Amino acid sequence: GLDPVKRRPGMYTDTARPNHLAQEVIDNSVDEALAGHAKQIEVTLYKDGSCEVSDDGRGMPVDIHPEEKIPGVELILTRLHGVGVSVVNALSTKVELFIKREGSEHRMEFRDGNAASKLEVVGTVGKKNTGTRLRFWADPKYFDTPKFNVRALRHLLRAKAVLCPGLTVKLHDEATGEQDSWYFENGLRDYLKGEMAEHEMLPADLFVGSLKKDTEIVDWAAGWVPEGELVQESYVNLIPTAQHGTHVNGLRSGLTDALREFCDFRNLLPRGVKLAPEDVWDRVTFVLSLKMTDPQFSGQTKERLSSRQAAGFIEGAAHDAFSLYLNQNVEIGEKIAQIAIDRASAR
Numbered sequence: 001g002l003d004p005v006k007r008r009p010g011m012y013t014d015t016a017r018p019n020h021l022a023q024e025v026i027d028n029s030v031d032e033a034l035a036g037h038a039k040q041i042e043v044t045l046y047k048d049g050s051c052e053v054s055d056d057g058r059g060m061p062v063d064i065h066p067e068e069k070i071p072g073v074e075l076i077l078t079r080l081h082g083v084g085v086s087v088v089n090a091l092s093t094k095v096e097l098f099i100k101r102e103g104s105e106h107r108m109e110f111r112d113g114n115a116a117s118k119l120e121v122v123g124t125v126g127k128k129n130t131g132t133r134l135r136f137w138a139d140p141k142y143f144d145t146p147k148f149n150v151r152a153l154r155h156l157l158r159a160k161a162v163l164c165p166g167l168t169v170k171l172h173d174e175a176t177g178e179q180d181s182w183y184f185e186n187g188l189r190d191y192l193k194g195e196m197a198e199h200e201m202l203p204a205d206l207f208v209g210s211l212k213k214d215t216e217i218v219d220w221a222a223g224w225v226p227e228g229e230l231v232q233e234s235y236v237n238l239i240p241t242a243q244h245g246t247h248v249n250g251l252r253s254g255l256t257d258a259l260r261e262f263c264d265f266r267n268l269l270p271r272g273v274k275l276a277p278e279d280v281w282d283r284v285t286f287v288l289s290l291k292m293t294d295p296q297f298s299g300q301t302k303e304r305l306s307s308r309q310a311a312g313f314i315e316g317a318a319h320d321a322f323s324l325y326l327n328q329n330v331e332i333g334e335k336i337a338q339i340a341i342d343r344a345s346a347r
């Protein structure tokens with residue numbers, strides 16, 4: 001039942017505004033992209049206060065539950081991250097979805113969380129034309145305001161394109177008429193490269209790496225920027241960790257050890273000078289994406305990754321990869337080392 005959600009909405013979403021509800025719907029479309037089924041996601045914010053999310057994924061199954069004898073889509077919508085789309089339906093005066101699947105376009109409507117129609121066959125489409133679109137009308141009585149924080153949504157949607165290479169994410173704000181489109185073929189590297197295009201850095205095209213250990217998967221892009229504002233973003237299962245944490249500590253620790261060993265072999269350290277992790281990390285710009293099973297968060301807001309396992313995993317990945325890179329790019333390596341050494345010497 002959805003009654004519990006209606007009684008205490010604050011326990012299932014952020015009642016400040018409907019942004020979180022939109023996130024839930026967006027996440028479901030992103031899963032299709034992460035699974036390699038969707039390549040396009042469009043979000044529309046309407047003047048009537050509703051929000052729609054459309055994707056070209058497989059589309060929600062349009063079959064009937066043998067026991068419940070009702071559409072599988074109905075069970076999903078009638079029965080913070082990963083709370084489920086049912087929460088969106090429960091806190092909306094109306095929800096309308098269109099599903100393109102198996103050569104047909106289907107429609108279903110809900111009102112105040114209850115089915116307001118049957119699963120209707122409303123169109124015929126090509127076999128390859130599939131996807132889901134869900135539009136919801138948040139019930140203002142549950143939120144301080146029905147208005148969306150568009151800026152926060154822009155940042156979040158861009159992250160999806162960054163974290164899922166090849167995915168095109170669009171946003172359309174009907175109130176203003178403003179449109180946005182994000183796409184990053186390479187993912188992390190293209191995004192970081194574009195965000196730092198105004199400053200000179202080492203490597204010029206960044207230092208990239210990745211490692212998969214059957215459950216743990218890490219991806220990163222980093223560079224040293226002598227002058228300029230640094231971009232520093234980390235994620236765990238697509239969840240942004242504003243306070244970074246154990247995964248970032250691993251990256252930092254691993255790049256530091258590689259650089260220190262490099263300075264040792266090349267004998268670049270001035271008399272009595274030793275590199276401290278802060279010397280190496282001070283001018284670093286990066287984007288880090290970790291994927292692990294059941295991550296644990298710490299901090300007064302759970303915006304920091306606490307999983308100790310993640311530290312050792314990434315440290316080993318960054319250590320081995322950066323050592324390899326430095327040893328095959330000596331000049332670039334010595335310039336990076338010098339940036340860190342200049343800090344150490346300046347102390």
Ligand SMILES: CO[C@@H]1[C@@H](OC(N)=O)[C@@H](O)[C@H](Oc2ccc3c(O)c(NC(=O)c4ccc(O)c(CC=C(C)C)c4)c(=O)oc3c2C)OC1(C)C
Pocket residue numbers: 027028029030031032055057058059060061063072076085132
């Ligand atoms: C809110 O629905 C979300 C989806 O939302 C979006 N935007 O696509 C998406 O996040 C994901 O969608 C899935 C998740 C799993 C399968 C999946 O396992 C499929 N393969 C099947 O063989 C299948 C075919 C019919 C059927 O009733 C079921 C069981 C239904 C499930 C597991 C939801 C599975 C399939 O064709 O489509 C799938 C789809 C579209 O999971 C949902 C349904 C909770």
